[PDB]
Design a protein around this nucleic acid. Structure first.
Ligand SMILES: [Cl-]
Ligand SMILES: [Cl-]
Ligand SMILES: [Cl-]
Ligand SMILES: [Cl-]
Ligand SMILES: [Mn+2]
Ligand SMILES: [Mn+2]
Ligand SMILES: [Mn+2]
Ligand SMILES: [Mn+2]
Ligand SMILES: [Mn+2]
Ligand SMILES: [Mn+2]
Ligand SMILES: [Mn+2]
Ligand SMILES: [Mn+2]
Ligand SMILES: [Mn+2]
Ligand SMILES: [Mn+2]
Ligand SMILES: [Mn+2]
Lengths: 97, 105, 78, 93, 94, 108, 99, 86
DNA sequence: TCAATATCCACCTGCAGATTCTACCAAAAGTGTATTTGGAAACTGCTCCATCAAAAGGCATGTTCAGCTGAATTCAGCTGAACATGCCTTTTGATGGAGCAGTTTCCAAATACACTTTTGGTAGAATCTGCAGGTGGATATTGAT
DNA sequence: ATCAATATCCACCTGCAGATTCTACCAAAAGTGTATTTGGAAACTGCTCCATCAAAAGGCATGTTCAGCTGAATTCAGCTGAACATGCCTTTTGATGGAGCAGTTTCCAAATACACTTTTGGTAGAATCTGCAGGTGGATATTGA
């Protein structure tokens, strides 16, 4: 009848995922999101399977990168919890906004 | 007739580099040494990365270099990291790194 | 479909990014960013597709779009 | 049909630094991207360099200045030597 | 004395068309030339790349058009594309 | 021979179609350059310099000046979402910045 | 009394003033000296077109001003109003000028 | 024919000048340590631009750095400057 | 420190998806020729860069002083983590048909050439004028009382 | 809820530095009559992309505790802003010598354009072999006590 304290398992996951390289977003859901968006620029499109993978890789490398800068912004404000405000500042300094 | 690579003492295709410069619309004419020089530069950088990725593999008890290994060699090298700072290596993940303030104790 | 991108999957991404604690509002915030990222890239790719007069988006179209957006990717033809 | 890549060359160079090591396909793909990218970067800069100086030919001098402007400190030095070493050897015998 | 070309003459014409009353300092004209040279570079560059990705050895108004859609944001693109096309169909009407 | 008509007037343009055509050929962009390419490009450039001169001219008027200077160009650009993005990584000499003070800094 | 503006009032007066103007804020000669020094350490016996020095000053000031905007956002984000070295460092790290 | 020795010119970027730049950048309050970090940051910025500019000067086999050298040097660094194009 | 629960870490092991080999044709790359021509000397005509002299006032420097801001200390209401529970959407193949990249095979239209002939542009000159820089009255704004 | 102390906002001048218009010579568009090449066009031909199916089985969606983090409140030492006195050194003008950019020609050494001859690299089956993914057993790291 035991539990790990808040954050212990979090650190454990940081360690696991920083060690691996597998894509972290489920494939099907992603392929579905991709085609939906594309459908708005041109209808009835077909995608090489590798084109969808390239997209998922870029997209996941971008988010992982964005979460690093966001973590830094949150720590800057003496917090340990990231918030929309942190993603906002990071994207602002990066000049994405 | 011996290849320009062997003559330049390279493993990289001087002939191909020359054809690629001529057809890439970079300039109207291309000197004979430019393909040689360029090919040497490309070979050297290629050896630099393979050398470090080979090491990264060995430090992993692996003999086949994979994407993760190329990522560890690059991000763990100040100069290579700067050169590829805006490049993303598919299937290479990220360097293990946890901000101090996030550790327990 | 954006909701297909789930909380736990966003948690994982966050984790690889070294994030320990996550506020509840981050999930919806993340999908918005994810969506702007994909729209900007896909749009650029489909433009390379339509130009090559194809109906199939190729890995190269994506690689060329990414390069344009300053997100150069290695491993798919360049 | 046919698709030319730098694979055999990357592989040859691999054996000279790590005779014992092999390289997965996905990794070979990454090395190709690497070589194409650096090629474009150097060629592109040599292109501008010649244009700024109103020259119609890209010589080894443009490739070298390009390397200096593109690669970080030590990488530039070593790349520069390898380059002039290869051109030198090529111009002799 | 190797004469140095510029877009000043045309920037000035266009200026008179939109603001008949208004003038432009030489520094501001300096900035306008940089702007025109920059956009030309970006468009031709992208056009160059585009033609190359499709084994095409020639850059046509079609390459310039896709370059424009890729480089300019929303509305600015829509309008530039109209003017571009309008100029081409007119030019071809001899 | 026949009347000498500039390609610009043939295209209904102010910008130099001939000049732009030579720049394409001599810029090493491609082996060959189509006829409509320099016409289409000269028009896009002209449209863009007309869009920012329209806006700059207004800033000039707003500041009660009849002569456009660099600051006027900055205002027109940074105040226009689209031009600001197009030139988001460009710096206009002697243009300064937009007046903008964060709310939190104002007297409470 | 004499009269004394409260701390912050003059600073705000200065922001409005400098954001209104476009002139360079660093003195010419000192800046020209800094350029010649740094240059000299790279290659000797160099000369500079007057334009070149001015192009450099225009670029440096546009860059510092822009860096201070970002730095200012970082301070505020930490619920402060005083920019500190750590803010400038956070901005450059996120701008990728040096992770 | 000896010009004096150039030393410590970074101190030519005075406290007042940095305060003004922060002002234009909209900064209201400035920590006492900002001034040394700023000079450090400016130093790095300048060197990279001057280094690249001087590289273009030498490739052109000139002894004079022109405004164009700086313009190309800035463009290389994604810091494009309008107004000195020639 | 005990003691238990759930995590990691190792050393072996065996099948299987990739890898590394092995066996052949065409584009590419290397040659031997004939022409071309870019841009490296060899001057030298003039920009404009480095320096010096001198005077003057805008501004940097260095202080005093105290307002109010950053930083340290509490505190407790909630948010976000850890988990056990229950369930359906993603993953994994295998089949099959079809859409559609890649090609081959034309050729009429569109480009590049060569060179002559015809002006639009650009380098000053000369002529014309915003507005920088000054200067006093509103009009406010700020801050003490 | 004034007032007094200052800072800011404006409209009125008007000669100087620049901007705009006037003049001429080319460098370079525009015209024309060939010579070449590109790439749009049907017709096919596989390659690989969607569907359609099924299971299973993770992996995700829900609720329940409650640990411990964030944000609100207070307190105050002393940092950093505002105001001043001083007088340094950047600015502003002018003038001069001369380093070194261009601007011209003159001419190979080196690159392009060709026509062939020979070799190498991309393919499409062969012939292994590096670890992924489990197993088991042995300390670890956490946590509640
Ligand atoms: Cl938030
Ligand atoms: Cl060469
Ligand atoms: Cl065309
Ligand atoms: Cl700090
Ligand atoms: Mn020195
Ligand atoms: Mn010649
Ligand atoms: Mn003093
Ligand atoms: Mn006190
Ligand atoms: Mn406070
Ligand atoms: Mn509690
Ligand atoms: Mn005329
Ligand atoms: Mn005034
Ligand atoms: Mn001389
Ligand atoms: Mn072979
Ligand atoms: Mn294993």
């Amino acid at each position: 009848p035991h539990r790990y304290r808040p954050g212990t398992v979090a650190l454990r996951e940081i360690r696991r995922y920083q060690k691996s390289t597998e894509l972290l977003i489920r494939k099907l859901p992603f392929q579905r999101l991709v085609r939906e968006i594309a459908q708005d620029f041109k209808t009835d499109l077909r995608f090489q399977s590798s084109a969808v993978m390239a997209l998922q890789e870029a997209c996941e490398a971008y988010l992982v990168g964005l979460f690093e800068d966001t973590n830094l912004c949150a720590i800057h404000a003496k917090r340990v919890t990231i918030m929309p405000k942190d993603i906002q500042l990071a994207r602002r300094i990066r000049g994405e906004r | 007739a011996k290849t320009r690579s062997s003559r330049a003492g390279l493993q990289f295709p001087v002939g191909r580099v020359h054809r690629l410069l001529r057809k890439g619309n970079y300039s109207e004419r291309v000197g004979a040494g430019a393909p040689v020089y360029l090919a040497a530069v490309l070979e050297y950088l290629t050896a630099e990365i393979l050398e470090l990725a080979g090491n990264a593999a060995r430090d992993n008890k692996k003999t086949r270099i994979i994407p993760r290994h190329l990522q560890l060699a690059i991000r763990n090298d100040e100069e290579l990291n700067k050169l590829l700072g805006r490049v993303t290596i598919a299937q290479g993940g990220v360097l293990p790194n946890i901000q101090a303030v996030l550790l327990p104790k | 479909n954006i909701q297909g991108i789930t909380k736990p999957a966003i948690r994982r991404l966050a984790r690889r990014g070294g994030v320990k604690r996550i506020s509840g509002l981050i999930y919806e915030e993340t999908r918005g960013v994810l969506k702007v990222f994909l729209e900007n890239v896909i749009r650029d790719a489909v433009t390379y597709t339509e130009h090559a007069q194809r109906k199939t988006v190729t890995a190269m179209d994506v690689v060329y779009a990414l390069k344009r957006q300053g997100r150069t990717l290695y491993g798919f033809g360049g | 049909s046919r698709k030319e890549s730098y694979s055999i060359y990357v592989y040859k160079v691999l054996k000279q630094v790590h005779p014992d090591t092999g390289i997965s396909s996905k990794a070979m793909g990454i090395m190709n991207s690497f070589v194409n990218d650096i090629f474009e970067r150097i060629a592109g800069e040599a292109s501008r360099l010649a244009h700024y100086n109103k020259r119609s030919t890209i010589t080894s001098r443009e490739i070298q200045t390009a390397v200096r402007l593109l690669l970080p400190g030590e990488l530039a030095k070593h790349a520069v030597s390898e380059g002039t070493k290869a051109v030198t050897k090529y111009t002799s015998a």
